[PDB]
Paper text:
Bovine heart cytochrome c oxidase (CcO) is an enzyme that functions in the cellular respiratory electron transport chain in the mitochondrial inner membrane. CcO accepts four electrons from cytochrome c to reduce molecular oxygen (O2) to two waters, coupled with the pumping of four protons through the membrane in each catalytic turnover. In its resting oxidized state, it binds a peroxide anion at the O2-reduction center, which consists of a copper ion and a heme iron. However, in synchrotron-based MX, the peroxide is readily reduced to water by X-ray irradiation while the diffraction image is recorded, and the bond length between the two oxygen atoms of the peroxide increases as the dose accumulates.
In particular, low-dose diffraction data were collected from CcO crystals using 30 keV X-rays at BL41XU, SPring-8. A highly sensitive pixel array detector equipped with a CdTe sensor (PILATUS3 X CdTe, DECTRIS) was utilized for data collection by the shutter-less helical scanning method. Maintaining the DWD at 58 kGy per data set by controlling translation-speed and frame-rate settings, we collected a diffraction data set at 1.9 Å resolution (dose estimation with RADDOSE-3D). Structure refinement with the ligand model, without any restraint on bond length between the two oxygen atoms, yielded a bond length of 1.66 Å, shorter than in previous work in which refinement was performed in a similar manner. c map contained a large residual peak next to the peroxide. The ligand bond length was further evaluated by fixing it during the refinement, and then varying it from 1.45 to 1.7 Å in increments of 0.05 Å to find the optimal value for describing the structure that yielded the optimal residual density map. Ultimately, the optimal bond length was determined to be 1.55 Å, which did not give large residual peaks neither outside nor beside the bond. This was identical to that in the damage-free structure obtained with SF-ROX. The final refinement model of CcO converged to a 10% minor component of ligand peroxide at the O2-reduction center, larger than the 5% minor component of the XFEL structure. This difference is likely to represent the structural change caused by specific radiation damage on the structure obtained in the current study using a finite exposure time at the synchrotron source.
Residue numbers in the entry:
A (entry chain K): 6 to 54
B (entry chain I): 1 to 73
C (entry chain H): 7 to 85
D (entry chain L): 2 to 47
E (entry chain G): 1 to 84
F (entry chain B): 1 to 227
G (entry chain E): 5 to 109
H (entry chain F): 1 to 98
Write the structure that this text describes.
């Protein structure tokens, strides 16, 4: 007879993966976290003195 | 219609081990080569190339003119 | 001899990372020499090398504490 | 003698799963909360 | 060493008793005599307030905080010198 | 100094730091090779339905397992120890500088000729000038002549600290009652940063080290002006 | 130690003992499958005839299943062994696991 | 030099200590201090395993110097065999302490 | 290992409850402290 | 009903009372050091003594009175005591390491010499030599006591054991007197620190060992030991030899070599 | 009855249960402390306060995780439950002393919590170095409370060690030599020897710290002719053997787990495993100054400590390769315990290897007191000692309780923890190489990206820890009673059923000499 | 049939691919027809039907090799649930960023970072490989 | 003195189910109760002292 995994495995995998990706993308990009990436290739140096 | 040939039946695990340990060895030497070329030699050459014609006074003068120093304006 | 003293040279008696005894010995040597000279009427100028060496090596606060203790009569090394 | 067997060789009851949930919650929860409250204690001094 | 004695035939209480009274206790009596000869107070040295001695980084938890546990006024000065 | 997303060591500023980088590359290669071989063999052991569960004879294989690693350890120890003794070799420094650790700042003493000493404190974040580095700048830098062998002597007047400058490969503990010695030789002018490297109480994070490496003539004039 | 032929002969002899008991049948098969090999047809033939003498049909089928299992991913071994055993299987009326539907998951 | 007044174990040992001492004197080992000596362990000559109940755990060190011990419960009744080496063991239940 | 079926089965719903209560027991007190940190600090 | 020879011990409150006495002693010391009070400490010391008393009382009940100490049990107690002594040797080893560390590399604060400037060591040939003769002599008398016991001689066991105890007490009184008479103190730098802490812990062990011998003395008076079974006596003799040997190392290291 | 049984115990299983409960509770405390660390470091700036509060948290984290979680669980917990069962003994040699080893731990923990409550806490590092830990720079009761906490934990473990050595030497069946006892038993006897020899030296050193703080001694104070470096020698003389104490029982459980889930009757190369553990134990006593390469010791001393430390890789390597040879040819059962053991073998290897990097005193000048050391020791502690503890716990839980865990939940738990610990510690290697110091409440801005990721990793570990509590609740809530366990012929601890009776081996096993 | 806890010391049944012949039969009690089947098994197995042979197998063994070695969908549940809890962890981090963390230091402001980057280049931070090595001092731009 | 060990062996082997720490009789119970009371009361007092010591008094 089909067990829990036969019946719900596909939904648990799909929705777990979707949720995980969505909420980490949100956390990583939408809430003001400063990752402090390299300035290399990114920042235009400005006169400081 | 036709019989099947007798396959090898003994030492199958040992044979698989021997083959792959040898493969692990081959890969290891292969990677050491990659690494000495892509990391170690690269580093020796970057440092040697940097210092080959390096002019420390000229470096200092550039820094001084950029205003970085307390002791040199 | 050695004028144009820059700093204290390597001393084979104190070849290791811990240089505490180097500072101490030179401080002692200077003051023992000075005592020997100020006494017998001679010149402290002959003690100069030890003075340069201990000055170079010794933390100011150590020299200063040792000087206070000599003045106090509580300096524990023999001079 | 003493009770033997599953659920009986332990100093806490597992007769009721909800009472057990409450006890386990107080137990692990008190351990986990203690450093936060000691931090609070140290901030609320000076 | 074989020490300098003799013995060993078999083993026993009798030999250890022999050793107790014939060697051990006489040795103690001799050291006791030696000690009683060199007893009587010595001539306490000038007080010098050396900074490596009479250490006080925290008051002692008894008395006035400034006396060691087995303070002897005759021979142990305070950080400030001997007592009156 | 470290830069954002840095994976490895700060660029070498001294010949000894340069030696440490190549020795690290050597050792890391071996580290990678062993950890990957272990991972691979694990996966190999676990990916077959073939079985052999009877008693296995151990002694032939334990020879390989002890001799190969013994060999690998010697191949690490040889360059490790060459560098160790290279670092210890006689220098003839041209100058001696002392640094005393304190809670929470460093003082410096250059007393070969004159009595020059000063305190060196972190620039508070609210006082940084634009472009300056949070937690790293000091009010009074340790100006030193470039391309010269310098003897650094390190101690403390209170608790333990440790005087470190990663780009020169330097780290010497600051111990009260002790004078520890290290040598410093910069191949380049510039600014070279370190941080207190022994836990020392409330502002351990906030007593950094900044060396300013310049030509001898500038160092002498700076020295004179600091008296 | 021993050649392959000597090992095989040992095992043939083991199962061929006329009055082998149930314990020895199980002990022999359970020990045998610990080795790095799929047993030669002549060994399995001797074990199957031991099953016959012990009136144990089910163990005969199990022995065929463990042959398949010991081959691992080498799918060519089991059908070869069954091929070599067909005269014995026919003679003793032993149905293979596949004939019994016992290869269905 | 010398008299008596110290009790002997014979006079004063009690409880289990005394039971072990009295049994040893008779060359018996009710409290399992000694390792039993193996028989040939055949079906005809099984290792005989005393017990005060109807089962006891046997550990079989199949060959001299094996580090692996094979453990199994031995029950009253027909002789059982070590699952690794086949040597025979038979339980012989009952009593202890005369 | 083999085992008997559960003597007191814990349904998916009961498990959601035990898991929620368990997580809340760790999260809420520490959460209350961290939320009020500034209150404690700037005090 | 067991058919092995090991001792299944009745459930006991003394581990808990011992553990709580450790809490009361340590929190008591803290209170004494920082909050000017001896109350917790006194309670801890009391419950500690009570725990020791009842626990070892029970061990005697289990062995002498109930017969649980089969040879297998005694053999475990032998190992236990030997391991305990090994742990105590390592504890002392840390204080000898401290002593050699400071004395082999005397720092400038000391005058750069050992003994430090201003330290006037005791004469190792006076009371310290007497103490050495005393503990060595007690090693001899305890051996006499052991042999008398094995040979079944009650009176001479008791005499020899009494002499051993008297010598322990003599050492303790001599040491107490030399602490009082010493011109240096535990605050006299690393000289006074190593001297008093090392010889102080040794003195505590002498008091512990003497107490253990006195327990054996009273148990002997009450006929507990047989000529073959007397592990409490052997354990006390081993511990007593340990205390002698630590003294000899202290005498050579601190009193003689460090003078 | 309850007090008689649980406060007055003389039973090795119940005392083992007590230790597991105590260790599990300590684990929650240590975990909260680890989260406060990573919350502080998870963004640049100051969250809690300056370095004092911060390092009180760091110091407590280490003491709790080491002395109250790892040691009690491994040695007190699994050692008490398993060692007497694995040698067919009726209990431990000193069943009543065993109980005191347990009961010293709540007061020790209380003392540690007191230290953090009073004054400003002990913000010293778990190494408690003077002069920071002295009476001027840490005036007041906190450090003394910490020393006393250590004193109680030390007595607990010393008496435990005496008990384990005696039990293992003296209470095996008369036919069983030491070379017929299982690897976990060997692991515990070697650990006990390490404890017996190392803790008394710690006790001497912290006692001399206590007297410098309170009786005006000057062991570590240059003003009296003392030396702060002397403290470090006495501490590390204990402290290096301590990390072998923390891993050896883990090695023992790993051997059993790997053998078991490979379907093998025995670990590969048994006597090499015994040799390896004894060699590691021995070499562990002669390498302590690799914790002091920057203090200013002579160059030949640093050459010796480098070389002697590196030798440890040889016997440790034999064990790793012998675990792999145990898997080889196995009928592999992918149980949650096996996943823990497999993760252990690999991640322990990585941590060991960064240990070998650090053994090199030349390179250690730059790596010492940086996050590279923190990354090394968390690979061997959070992914070595901890993975062995989780492996042993899930493997023997049915033996101890008589109930089964849900294996699917336990696999989910392993997956979450594996991601969290690697996310936490892997980037710390980069932070170390690039120079981030230890024991900092805040860091120059360049270190932000790795500290952020590391803190996010620590939250994933928190989720695993919370899920673990739920999983244990679910097992007791559902009451799936154990029926059959395989491989009992080579796993004696299972042979009396699940859970075994209160008294086992009342009639000892029968084992022939032959 | 039914396995009891009180039976732990008795030989037991196991389905293990490396222990093909377990210590006991799966079913030891026989009905009238199962007893007749065991009698028939004493005669030629060629006279047994397929159903009878299957029945004899199922009395001796619980699961066949194919059944006992079957794969499952468990990995899906495991990976999916693990990713869920990992996803849940991000909610904790979102809560922390919102309610616990304040503003990060002003040195992360975009203009501060541009100036600091220039000053780092002026001081030639990591000029051999790490940082300034990636700046082109001639073309005044990041190296391509 | 006379050897009275036999009387003590009878007393402590009496089949009365008492644990060894209480088997001497009523004074065992008294001493036990004193010890436990001092231990438990002392522990509560130590907790009071921590409470007291956990807050400033300057
Ligand atoms: C369980 C805990 C544990 C364990 C087992 C170890 C194991 C080892 N450790 Fe570690 N360590 C710590 C916990 C531990 N460590 C802690 C907590 C600290 C910090 C203390 C503090 O300051 O707070 C620390 C610090 C520490 C330092 C000090 C660094 C510094 O402070 O600057 C060093 C230096 O040598 C060191 C080295 C080693 C080595 C060589 C091993 C070896 O035992 C590892 C051997 C294993 C392997 C090598 C892997 C397997 C082997 C093979 C697969 C064979 C082939 C390998 C080779 C040929 C190399 N460790
Ligand atoms: C066993 C030891 C151990 C363990 C497991 C850990 C685990 C963790 N540690 Fe630990 N750490 C140390 C020992 C340990 N640590 C030590 C010795 C130091 C140095 C202290 C000093 O400098 O003075 C230190 C320092 C240290 C620092 C450096 C602080 C600094 O230098 O400023 C950091 C920062 O990230 C850190 C973080 C963490 C994290 C996020 C975890 C997480 O991985 C924790 C996650 C949770 C667990 C691993 C589970 C806990 C276990 C249970 C709940 C058991 C349940 C059991 C049963 C049911 C049987 N630790
Ligand atoms: C023959 C003498 C026998 C000793 C009996 C004397 C009484 C004190 C107790 C000593 C026991 C030894 C412990 C070690 C501590 C230091 C005391 C050293 C011995 C001693 O008694 O030293 C005295 C100082 O005592 C002082 O400070 C007083 C100190 C009293 C407070 C004790 C501190 C508690 C320490 C606890 C340590 C924990 C134990 C470790 C457990 C390890 C577990 C693994 C010396 O006196 P003084 O006036 O300085 O000089 C003499 C001048 N005429
Ligand atoms: C101010 C600070 C407070 C300090 C505390 C002061 C301490 C004083 C304690 C002195 C020690 C007394 C020990 C008494 C033990 C009596 C019980 C006993 O000796 O029990 C014996 C077993 O041995 C056994 O347990 C042997 C038991 C081992 C005892 C070990 C004793 C040393 C422990 C002392 C603690 C050390 C502290 C360290 C300090 C750093 C009983 O067996 P037998 O003798 O064979 O008898 C049976 C025959 O009769 C049969 O015919
Ligand atoms: C490091 C481990 C822990 C980190 C992750 C913690 C996740 C937090 C779980 C929720 O914690 C709660 O958060 C609420 C806010 O969401 C707080 O309510 C606070 O905020 C509410 C809305 O602002 C008010 O209604 C409440 O009164 C006020 O207490 C509440 O106190 C606190 O228990
Ligand atoms: Cu100064 Cu850390
Ligand atoms: O300690 O590694
Ligand atoms: Cu170490
Ligand atoms: Mg350091
Ligand atoms: Na004797
Ligand atoms: Na921070
Ligand atoms: Zn056998």
């Amino acid at each position: 007879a089909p067990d829990f995994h036969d019946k719900y495995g596909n939904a648990v995998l799909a929705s777990g993966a979707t949720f995980c990706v969505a909420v980490w993308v949100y956390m990583a990009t939408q809430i003001g976290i400063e990752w402090n990436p390299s300035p290399v290739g990114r920042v235009t140096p400005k006169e400081w003195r | 219609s036709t019989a099947l040939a007798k396959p090898q039946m003994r030492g199958l695990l040992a044979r698989r081990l021997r083959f792959h340990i040898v493969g692990a060895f081959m890969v290891s030497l292969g990677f050491a080569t990659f690494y000495k070329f892509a990391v170690a030699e690269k580093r020796k050459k970057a440092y040697a190339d940097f210092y080959r014609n390096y002019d420390s006074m000229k470096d200092f003068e550039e820094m001084r003119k950029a205003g970085i120093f307390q002791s040199a304006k | 001899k050695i004028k144009n003293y820059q700093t204290a040279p390597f001393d084979s008696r104190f070849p290791n990372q811990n240089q505490t005894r180097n500072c101490w010995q030179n401080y002692l040597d200077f003051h023992r020499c000075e005592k020997a000279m100020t006494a017998k009427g001679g010149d402290v100028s002959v003690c100069e090398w030890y003075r340069r060496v201990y000055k170079s090596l010794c933390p100011i606060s150590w020299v200063s504490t040792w000087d206070d203790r000599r003045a106090e009569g509580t300096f524990p090394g023999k001079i | 003698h003493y009770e033997e067997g599953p659920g009986k060789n332990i100093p806490f009851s597992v007769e009721n799963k909800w009472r057990l949930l409450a006890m386990m919650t107080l137990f692990f929860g008190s351990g986990f909360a203690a450093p936060f409250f000691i931090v609070r204690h140290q901030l609320l001094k000076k | 060493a074989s020490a300098a004695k003799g013995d060993h035939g078999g083993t026993g209480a009798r030999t250890w008793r022999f050793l107790t009274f014939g060697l051990a206790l006489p040795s103690v009596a001799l050291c006791t005599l030696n000690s009683w000869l060199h007893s009587g107070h010595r001539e306490r040295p000038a007080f010098i307030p050396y900074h490596h001695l009479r250490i006080r980084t925290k008051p002692f938890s008894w008395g006035d905080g400034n006396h060691t546990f087995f303070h002897n006024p005759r021979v142990n000065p305070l950080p400030t010198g001997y007592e009156k | 100094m470290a830069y954002p997303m840095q994976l490895g060591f700060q660029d070498a500023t001294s010949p000894i730091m340069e030696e440490l980088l190549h020795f690290h590359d050597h050792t890391l290669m071996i580290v990678f090779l062993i950890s990957s071989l272990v991972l691979y063999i694990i996966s190999l052991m676990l990916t077959t339905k073939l079985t052999h569960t009877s008693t296995m004879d151990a002694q032939e294989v334990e020879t390989i397992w002890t001799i190969l690693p013994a060999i690998i350890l010697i191949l690490i120890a040889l360059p490790s120890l060459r560098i160790l003794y290279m670092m210890d070799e006689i220098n003839n420094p041209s100058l001696t500088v002392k640094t005393m650790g304190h809670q929470w700042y460093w003082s410096y003493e250059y007393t070969d000729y004159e009595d020059l000493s000063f305190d060196s404190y972190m620039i508070p974040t609210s006082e940084l000038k634009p472009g300056e580095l949070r937690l790293l700048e000091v009010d009074n830098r340790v100006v030193l002549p470039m391309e010269m062998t310098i003897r650094m002597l390190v101690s403390s007047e209170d608790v333990l600290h440790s005087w470190a400058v990663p780009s020169l490969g330097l780290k010497t503990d600051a111990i009260p009652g002790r004078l520890n010695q290290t040598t410093l030789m910069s191949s380049r002018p510039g600014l070279y940063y370190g941080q207190c490297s022994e836990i020392c109480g409330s502002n351990h994070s906030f007593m950094p080290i900044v060396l300013e490496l310049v030509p001898l003539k500038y160092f002498e004039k700076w020295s004179a002006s600091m008296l | 130690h021993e050649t392959d032929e000597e090992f095989d002969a040992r095992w043939v002899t083991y199962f061929n003992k006329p009055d082998i008991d149930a314990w020895e049948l199980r002990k022999g098969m359970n020990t045998l499958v610990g080795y790095d090999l799929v047993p030669e047809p002549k060994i399995i033939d001797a074990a199957l005839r031991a099953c016959r003498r012990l009136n144990d049909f089910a163990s005969a089928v199990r022995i065929l299943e463990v042959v398949k299992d010991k081959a691992g991913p080498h799918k060519e071994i089991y059908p070869y062994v069954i091929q070599e055993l067909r005269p014995t299987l026919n003679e003793l009326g032993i149905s293979t696991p596949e004939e019994l539907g016992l290869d269905k998951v | 030099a010398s008299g008596g007044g110290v009790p002997t174990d014979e006079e004063q040992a009690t409880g289990l200590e005394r039971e072990v001492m009295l049994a040893a004197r008779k060359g018996q080992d009710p409290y399992n201090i000694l390792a039993p000596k193996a028989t040939s362990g055949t079906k005809e000559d099984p290792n005989l395993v005393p017990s005060i109940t109807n089962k006891r755990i046997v550990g079989c060190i199949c060959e001299e110097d094996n580090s692996t011990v094979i453990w199994f419960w031995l029950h009253k009744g027909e002789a059982q065999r070590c699952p690794s080496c086949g040597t025979h063991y038979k339980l012989v239940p009952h009593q202890l302490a005369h | 290992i083999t085992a008997k079926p559960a003597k007191t089965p814990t349904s998916p719903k009961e498990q959601a409850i035990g898991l929620s209560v368990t997580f809340l027991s760790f999260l809420l007190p520490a959460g209350w402290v961290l939320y009020h940190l500034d209150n404690y600090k700037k005090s | 009903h067991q058919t092995h020879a090991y001792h299944m011990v009745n459930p006991s409150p003394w581990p808990l009372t011992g553990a709580l006495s450790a809490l009361l002693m340590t929190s008591g010391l803290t209170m004494w050091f920082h909050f000017n009070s001896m109350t917790l400490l006194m309670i801890g010391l009391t419950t500690n003594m009570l725990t020791m008393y009842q626990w070892w009382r029970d061990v005697i009940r289990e062995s002498t009175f109930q017969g649980h100490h089969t040879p297998a049990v005694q053999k475990g107690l032998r190992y236990g005591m030997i391991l305990f002594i090994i742990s105590e040797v390592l504890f002392f080893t840390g204080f000898f390491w401290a002593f050699y560390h400071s004395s082999l590399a005397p720092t400038p604060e000391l005058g750069g010499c050992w003994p430090p400037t201003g330290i006037h060591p005791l004469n190792p040939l006076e009371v310290p030599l007497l103490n050495t003769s005393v503990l060595l002599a007690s090693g001899v008398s305890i051996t006499w006591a052991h042999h008398s016991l094995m040979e079944g001689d009650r009176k001479h066991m008791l005499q020899a054991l009494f002499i051993t105890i008297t010598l322990g007490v003599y050492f303790t009184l001599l040491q107490a007197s030399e602490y009082y008479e010493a011109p240096f103190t535990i605050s006299d730098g690393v000289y006074g620190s190593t001297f008093f802490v090392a010889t102080g812990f040794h003195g505590l062990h002498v008091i512990i060992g003497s107490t253990f011998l006195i327990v054996c003395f009273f148990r002997q008076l009450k006929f507990h030991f047989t000529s073959n079974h007397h592990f409490g006596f052997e354990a006390a003799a081993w511990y007593w030899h340990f205390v002698d040997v630590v003294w000899l190392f202290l005498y050579v290291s601190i009193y003689w070599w460090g003078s | 009855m309850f007090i008689n049984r649980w406060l007055f115990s003389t039973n090795h299983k119940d005392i083992g249960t007590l230790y597991l409960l105590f260790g599990a509770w300590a684990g929650m405390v240590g975990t909260a402390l680890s989260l406060l660390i990573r919350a502080e470091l998870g963004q640049p700036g100051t969250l809690l306060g300056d370095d004092q509060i911060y390092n009180v948290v760091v110091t407590a984290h280490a003491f709790v995780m080491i002395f109250f979680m790892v040691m009690p669980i491994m040695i007190g917990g699994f050692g008490n439950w398993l060692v007497p069962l694995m040698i067919g003994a009726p209990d431990m040699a000193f069943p009543r002393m065993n109980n005191m080893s347990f009961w010293l731990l709540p007061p020790s923990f209380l003392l540690l919590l007191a230290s953090s409550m009073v004054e400003a806490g002990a913000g010293t590092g778990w190494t408690v170095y003077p002069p920071l830990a002295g009476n001027l720079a840490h005036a007041g009761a906190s450090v003394d409370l910490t020393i006393f906490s250590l004193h109680l934990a030390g007595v607990s473990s010393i008496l435990g060690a005496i008990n384990f050595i005696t039990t293992i030497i003296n209470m095996k069946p008369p036919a069983m030599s030491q070379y017929q006892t299982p690897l976990f038993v060997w692991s515990v006897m070697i650990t006990a020897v390490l404890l017996l020899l190392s803790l008394p030296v710690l006790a001497a050193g912290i006692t001399m710290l206590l007297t410098d703080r309170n009786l005006n001694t000057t062991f570590f104070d240059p003003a009296g002719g003392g030396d702060p470096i002397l403290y470090q020698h006495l501490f590390w003389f204990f402290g290096h053997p301590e990390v072998y104490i923390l891993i050896l029982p883990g090695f023992g459980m790993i051997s059993h787990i790997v053998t078991y889930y490979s379907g093998k009757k025995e670990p590969f190369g048994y006597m090499g495993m015994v040799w390896a553990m004894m060699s590691i134990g021995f070499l562990g006593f002669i390498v302590w100054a690799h914790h002091m390469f920057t203090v200013g010791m002579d160059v030949d001393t640093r050459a010796y400590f480098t070389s002697a430390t590196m030798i440890i890789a040889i016997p440790t390597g034999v064990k790793v390769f012998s675990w792999l040879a145990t898997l080889h040819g196995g009928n592999i059962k992918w149980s949650p315990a096996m996943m823990w053991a497999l993760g252990f073998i690999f991640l322990f290897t990585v941590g060991g290897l960064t240990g070998i990097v650090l053994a090199n005193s030349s390179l250690d000048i730059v790596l010492h007191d940086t996050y590279y050391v923190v990354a090394h020791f968390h690979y061997v502690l959070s992914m070595g000692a901890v993975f062995a503890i989780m492996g042993g716990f899930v493997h023997w839980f049915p033996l101890f309780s008589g109930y089964t865990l849900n294996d699917t939940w336990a696999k989910i738990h392993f997956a979450i923890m594996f991601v969290g610990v690697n996310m936490t510690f892997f980037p710390q290697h980069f932070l170390g190489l690039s120079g981030m110091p230890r024991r900092y409440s805040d860091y120059p801005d360049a270190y932000t990206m790795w500290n952020t990721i590391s803190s996010m990793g620590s939250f994933i570990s928190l989720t695993a820890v919370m899920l673990m509590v739920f999983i244990i609740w679910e097992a007791f809530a559902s009451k799936r009673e154990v029926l059959t366990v395989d491989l009992t012929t080579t796993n004696l601890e299972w042979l009396n059923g699940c859970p075994p009776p209160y008294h086992t081996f009342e009639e000892p096993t029968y084992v022939n000499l032959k | 049939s039914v396995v009891k806890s009180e039976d732990y010391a008795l030989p037991s049944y196991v389905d293990r691919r490396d222990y093909p012949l377990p210590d006991v039969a799966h079913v030891k009690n026989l009905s009238a027809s199962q007893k007749a089947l065991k009698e028939k098994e004493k005669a030629s197995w060629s006279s047994l039907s397929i159903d009878e042979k299957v029945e004899l197998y199922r009395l001796k063994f619980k699961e066949s090799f194919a059944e006992m070695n079957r794969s499952t969908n468990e990995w899906k549940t495991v990976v999916g649930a693990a990713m869920f809890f990992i996803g849940f962890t991000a909610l904790l981090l979102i809560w922390e960023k919102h309610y616990v963390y304040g503003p990060i230091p002003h040195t992360f402001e975009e203009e501060w970072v541009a100036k600091q980057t220039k000053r780092m280049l002026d001081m030639k931070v990591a000029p051999i490989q790490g940082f300034s090595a990636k700046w082109d001092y001639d073309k005044n731009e990041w190296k391509k | 003195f006379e050897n009275r060990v036999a009387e003590k062996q009878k007393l402590f082997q009496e089949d009365n189910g008492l644990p060894v720490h209480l088997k001497g009789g009523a004074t065992d119970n008294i001493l036990y109760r004193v010890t436990m009371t001092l231990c438990l009361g002392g522990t509560l007092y130590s907790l009071y002292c921590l409470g007291w010591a956990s807050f400033p008094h300057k």
